[PDB]
Design a protein around this motif. Sequence first.
Motif, PDB file in Angstrom:
ATOM      1  N   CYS A  90       0.840  -1.190   0.000  1.00  0.00           N
ATOM      2  CA  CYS A  90       0.000   0.000   0.000  1.00  0.00           C
ATOM      3  C   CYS A  90       0.877   1.243   0.000  1.00  0.00           C
ATOM      4  N   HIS A 135      -8.109   4.838   4.417  1.00  0.00           N
ATOM      5  CA  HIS A 135      -7.192   5.765   5.068  1.00  0.00           C
ATOM      6  C   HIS A 135      -7.908   7.080   5.337  1.00  0.00           C
ATOM      7  N   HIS A 169      -8.061  -0.850   1.967  1.00  0.00           N
ATOM      8  CA  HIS A 169      -7.598   0.037   3.026  1.00  0.00           C
ATOM      9  C   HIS A 169      -8.397   1.332   2.981  1.00  0.00           C
ATOM     10  N   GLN A 190       0.122   4.292   0.729  1.00  0.00           N
ATOM     11  CA  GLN A 190      -0.166   5.148   1.875  1.00  0.00           C
ATOM     12  C   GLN A 190       0.551   4.662   3.127  1.00  0.00           C
ATOM     13  N   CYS A 191       0.577   3.349   3.349  1.00  0.00           N
ATOM     14  CA  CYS A 191       1.144   2.783   4.564  1.00  0.00           C
ATOM     15  C   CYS A 191       2.634   2.483   4.457  1.00  0.00           C
TER      16      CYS A 191
HETATM   17 ZN   LIG Z   1      -2.858   1.306   3.459  1.00  0.00          ZN
END
Ligand SMILES: [Zn+2]
Lengths: 40, 42, 1362, 72, 235
Positions: free
Chosen positions: C1138, C1318, C1316, C1140-1141
């Motif tokens: 991911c 977010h 996910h 973002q993570c």
């Molecule tokens: Zn994520």
Amino acid sequence: RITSLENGLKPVYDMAKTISSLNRVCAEMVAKYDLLVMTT
Amino acid sequence: ESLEQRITSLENGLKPVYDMAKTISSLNRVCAEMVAKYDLLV
Amino acid sequence: QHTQYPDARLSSPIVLDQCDLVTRACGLYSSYSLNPQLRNCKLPKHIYRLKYDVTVTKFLSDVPVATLPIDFIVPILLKALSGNGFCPVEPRCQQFLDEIIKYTMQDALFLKYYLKNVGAQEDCVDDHFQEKILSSIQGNEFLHQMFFWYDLAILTRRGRLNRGNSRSTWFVHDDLIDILGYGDYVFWKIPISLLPLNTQGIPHAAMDWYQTSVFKEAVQGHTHIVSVSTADVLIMCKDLITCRFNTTLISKIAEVEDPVCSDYPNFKIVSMLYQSGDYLLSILGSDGYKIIKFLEPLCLAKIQLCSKYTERKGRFLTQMHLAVNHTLEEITEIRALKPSQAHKIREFHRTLIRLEMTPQQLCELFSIQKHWGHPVLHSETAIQKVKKHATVLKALRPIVIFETYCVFKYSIAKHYFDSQGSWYSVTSDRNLTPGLNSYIKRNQFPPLPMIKELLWEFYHLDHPPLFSTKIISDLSIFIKDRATAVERTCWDAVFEPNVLGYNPPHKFSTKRVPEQFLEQENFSIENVLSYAQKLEYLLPQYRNFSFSLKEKELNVGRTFGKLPYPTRNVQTLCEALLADGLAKAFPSNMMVVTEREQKESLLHQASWHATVRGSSFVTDLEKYNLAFRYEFTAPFIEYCNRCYGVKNVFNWMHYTIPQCYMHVSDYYNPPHNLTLENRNNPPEGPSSYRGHMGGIEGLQQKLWTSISCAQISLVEIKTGFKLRSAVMGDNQCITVLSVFPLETDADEQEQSAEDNAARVAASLAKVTSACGIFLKPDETFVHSGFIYFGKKQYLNGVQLPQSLKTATRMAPLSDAIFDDLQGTLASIGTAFERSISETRHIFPCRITAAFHTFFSVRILQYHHLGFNKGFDLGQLTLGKPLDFGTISLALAVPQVLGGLSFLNPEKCFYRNLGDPVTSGLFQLKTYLRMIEMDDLFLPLIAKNPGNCTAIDFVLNPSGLNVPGSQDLTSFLRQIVRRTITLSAKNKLINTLFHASADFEDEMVCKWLLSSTPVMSRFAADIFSRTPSGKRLQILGYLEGTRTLLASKIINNNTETPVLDRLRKITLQRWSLWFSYLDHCDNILAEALTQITCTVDLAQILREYSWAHILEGRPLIGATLPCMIEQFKVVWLKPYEQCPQCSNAKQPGGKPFVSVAVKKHIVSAWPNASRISWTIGDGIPGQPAIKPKCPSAALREAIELASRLTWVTQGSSNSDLLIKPFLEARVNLSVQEILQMTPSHYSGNIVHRYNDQYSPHSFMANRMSNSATRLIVSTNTLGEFSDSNIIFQNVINYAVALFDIKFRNTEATDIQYNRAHLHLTKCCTREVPAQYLTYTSTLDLDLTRYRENELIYDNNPLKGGLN
Amino acid sequence: EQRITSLENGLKPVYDMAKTISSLNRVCAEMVAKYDLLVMTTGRATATAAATEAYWAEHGQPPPGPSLYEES
Amino acid sequence: SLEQRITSLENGLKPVYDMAKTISSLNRVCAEMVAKYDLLVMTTGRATATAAATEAYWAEHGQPPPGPSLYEESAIRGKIESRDETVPQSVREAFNNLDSTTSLTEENFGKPDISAKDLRNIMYDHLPGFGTAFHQLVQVICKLGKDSNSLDIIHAEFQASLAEGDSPQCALIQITKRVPIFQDAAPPVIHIRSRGDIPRACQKSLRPVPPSPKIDRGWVCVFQLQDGKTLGLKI
RNA sequence: UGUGUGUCCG
Ligand SMILES: [Zn+2]
């Protein structure tokens, strides 16, 4: 103490009388059952 | 000795006889009420 | 001007008795009624002048004297009426057709853009989408017929006014057919050569009216024939055409979304079904509904035939086939059908039998039962049907009655023991119950399996009353704007004097509930109780009980009863008392599914003294009302009387009904042989009778439901099985749990469960029959996986869709008080939301709603019934003609800002919105971004605040001070208050509505908002427990326009007439919308600039409004973020990282919610291709003293004291503030109520009001099949970014987003494993712990309230304390 | 003397009481057995009779005319 | 002296303790009887209509008397079985309705009653068109089932075959090729005048008859004419 | 002149 035996005897005679009354009332109830239901 | 035995004998037959007398009185009362209800029917 | 307002939808039974009068005035012949009195009676003043009407004589100049019934002609009219002729309406409905299509295309484009923006959209899109929908819309079969029928409806509805002299007619000539309309009567002139013929050479319609030889010479040299009907048939035909158009459009559109397999049957089979039903009706008359009625059971059987096919699954279909064959054979033997017609008449049920569709398509087809019309009703047949089953003699078994009574008492005692602590202090000679004495002494209760030798012991138990008679917490039940029966003195005053033949001696003053509640001087709850206890309903003048025929159905006729006013009050009070006392010991509504329950809990529940299997069977609760006799229901009624302090309250019906004279209050036909001589003692005939020994539908429903539950419990006790029951509408469903060992396979388990269910059904049939109530073994079916009940159908744990029943009812015209546009649009939006709650497609329902919205707007603009002919609402409110752009822009701004928009795409995810203002702002911003009008937000959202008081703010805590967002409720409430001021000699209402009531309400509202900071939800919750709330709930009882325009008390208050005020307010409201660039200001727009946040925008908008209320104090607990703008989706793949993570999550990282898909499939029907077709594994301080049987006032006082104590915790004024509120409710003083108040110790009162007190239940807006196939992890949020996040809506949003994303793709190709969510770093804030602070005191005198009802009561601690 | 009289009074009917108890038990059980084989029909004058009886038990007088459905 | 009297009193008072155990059951049965008959008298009004009264009321104006009445199972059953004393029709139908539901068990609860005509109509409702030889096959199947008392096996097997997936024609094929009574049976022969009685759809199915016809092989019926003309039908 | 032709319990 001896004279207290009446307290231990007076319920028994009333017990017998009430038993007789109960027998009479049940026999009387049988009459109504016979008179109400058609039966055979 | 004899008086104490008599007192014990009197005490022994106290509760159950009273209880059954009460039960018989209650049964007689309810049976009489039911018969009174049935009386005004014939 | 006028006091008439005909409605736009059918809401009355179809009776044609009065038509026989009309044909007598014109010189024709007709036989519609079975009453000979109408054959030679006296015609009214109107419909007698028809002999002097030149138009009528010209119309009836080339037609025979004989006529034909209308029930043989409706299918013919439906088939052969298209829009090609000339109509008197100047703006034809077909003229504005292109604009509707353009608006529908725009709405579809906006929905697609919104879905793509959120992140759901769809994979592998196609370019040919708009043209396909346009061709589908323009290719509909019923496109022009609907417009023609709407024109006809407008004509007849406008013509039904003008009750005065010199009435007019209207004429329509549509090619083959001619239509003439005159004052609720319609003449149809049709060609003869298009009617089906008999074997004797006459039409099938003329068999029952004329002989074979008379009709032939009657017609002789003629080619056109005339039929006469009322204006209800036209409305019914319009409704049928609209329903057919909607069904065809939805079925056609759904094929574009999912070409492979859709959840709707088809658009070609339904047309064949319509044609077959029309032919059957045209041949068989009104008796074809006996065959039409078999559609639903056949669909149920076909659904049941989609399982493992045990031995007894096919019995239901065989029984239904035999029944339909017998019914078809026994209604056609007299009629002389030709062999070809005989072969053709069975095509309907032969097509139904030979169907081959998936269970979802059958469940959808289940909802087209009422698409052919409704039968014509007669009083005689309905009365004859009711007389049977009501005067019949029954045989009963006393032993079963004894057992049922004992189970009733045991259930009541068990419910009392489960709550409320322990036993209820049994009096009356404990020696008469040997065996229960041990349990009472030990303060325990028998389990259940061992209560078979001590069941009789429950007969001797005696106790004080367990419930209170002053638990009325809603005075709106005694005033509901309905109709009642009249006194026995003037019982015959409800019939027309001309048809009666004599002028009735005595007349009634009024016949409606509200005009009798206000003039009852001695009204009180205690007065009603004393009226019932003195047997005052047996007075000679209080025994009428009229009948009234029920609404649109498919039977030969069903009725409901009407009672005079005091007996109606007694009935209402009895129902209210039962709803709060008994009937809670017998839980009726219990919905459980074995495949959707935890195994451990199911095993624990099924254990009586290992896998668990369950079966079920369904029985009907419709006719049982007529099977109840006093000999069976007497002990239960006496026990219900004893549980309260009353004597003769619950047996009013069995005492007063047999003494009444039964008749149907039909206006145009009285009972047979009714004269002025035998008026006091009228005779009984085909439509009347005297001895009614059964019950009546509707009345005393709760007691009978409790008795049925007791019977089911007795059956469960008799046979050692675990039984659960559910009751809804007119049906009940009983499920049986069998529990099985481990090593017993899974093939014979279903057979054994079905055998156990059959055994339980046989035992229940015997038990019910012994009480005088007979079951139907032919109709009762036993299954193992399929359960249908009320509004929910499940097949082996898989929910089945049902969306046509709600979607097909969309219509431009509805009854919404003076044809209000806002009400119509709100109804359309609600229908769309309810329809989309089911099914798995989205576009068809939205397209239908968008089609109907524009059509309603235009038809109300041009053809409003409240004004004169030729009136244009859109011309004289703006000065220029209304164009497409203004309407399109005015339908996009949400209603919370005052903008006539009710179709929010966000409703596709979840039902209840946390904050409507933020959602509306987001929707408007997205819409303005889609088109190139982005520089238009501020003038649209600026507007001008109106004038309001604190009462308005309390009424709508989450609203705004926008004049255009208000409803018509305030106007009606003001009218009702004005009427009450000059009337209502009720002598107890007058005390409540004293001179300074408005001032007191204003002071209370002002004080409640004087805190710091100001909270609106708390004030709204507190306000409802004061006398002001009682006055508010009493005021709002108006429901319809006819009551407003025809009420005697309302319209006799002098002043300006109501019609002029209605016209003025309608003009003002229409000017408020569609105008723009006028009602805005240039002082708030610049303050709202450069904000770039929805939460801040909403807060500033809220604080700018209500500024005259909130001087400078902050406002809290009213603004919540929009969850669409709060989270962002990533849609991860099975083996991916991911961004973002991983990419930017170095310093702190981003909290997120994880969604993952399971693999275990449990069950699937018919296959596992679609996600929605399968389900998986996975489940979606005490007070010191407890009062016994507390009153409603005591409960309200306790709740109010607890709320005030908890809200203001950091201050020391908790003693002085509560006292003035309690002085007007309860006799007890402070420091006594505080002992009974539960100790509440919570934090962040905003969280408690949001999700603990539960103003709304939230829940989801999608089918619950997908929720079982997902696992959602929220603990990954860490510190949870308390906060503004509502977890229930988070789960709903995730589940709905996953469902919408993959809805037309088979499961084997879904390439996404996990998702996910977010959270963004802009719309999330931290809410601190704040408490209200009041510096002053209410300091108002509330001691004047010393009356009954929901007001101050004396001696509140009467029932004792725990 | 008095003890002998007390013994005679307390022992004279007890055998009769024991004999009567068994007969009472038998007849009660046999009546209970009879009760399970009854069939009751419904008449057309039950509600009227109940209403009249209830009306007589409160401001005792016949209900006002005209007469009820089945006055008998 | 007094000690002997006390001992005798104790001896005489000993055997009255045991009656409590047998009076407890008396209490139980009396309470049960009182409850039952109290509810019985409660549920019936003041018009109980004693047996003599209803017997007299049945004789003239035979309608049942006003108010409830009590009977017995065997008594009313025997009264009904003898149609000489003119038992009222309403009482007859009420007792028949009450009694008809006692013959209900785990089996035969919703089991339908299937006759020849009903089965023929059900089979007709499934076949397409009219005048096909399959109609003649259905007719002969129903006739053979009626004369062999095997209608329910035929219907059950037909329903199973239809539900598993094959067409109704295949269902009839399995009916005629699986039921034991349809093994080595001569097809029935009917009498016809000419081709007019033969349906138009059956024209293609005429075939010269060979010796030893078989119902299983595909011979549904044999058409015979006056002048020794015998023909059969093939599916 | 056609009393508001009607539109009840949940
Ligand atoms: Zn994520």
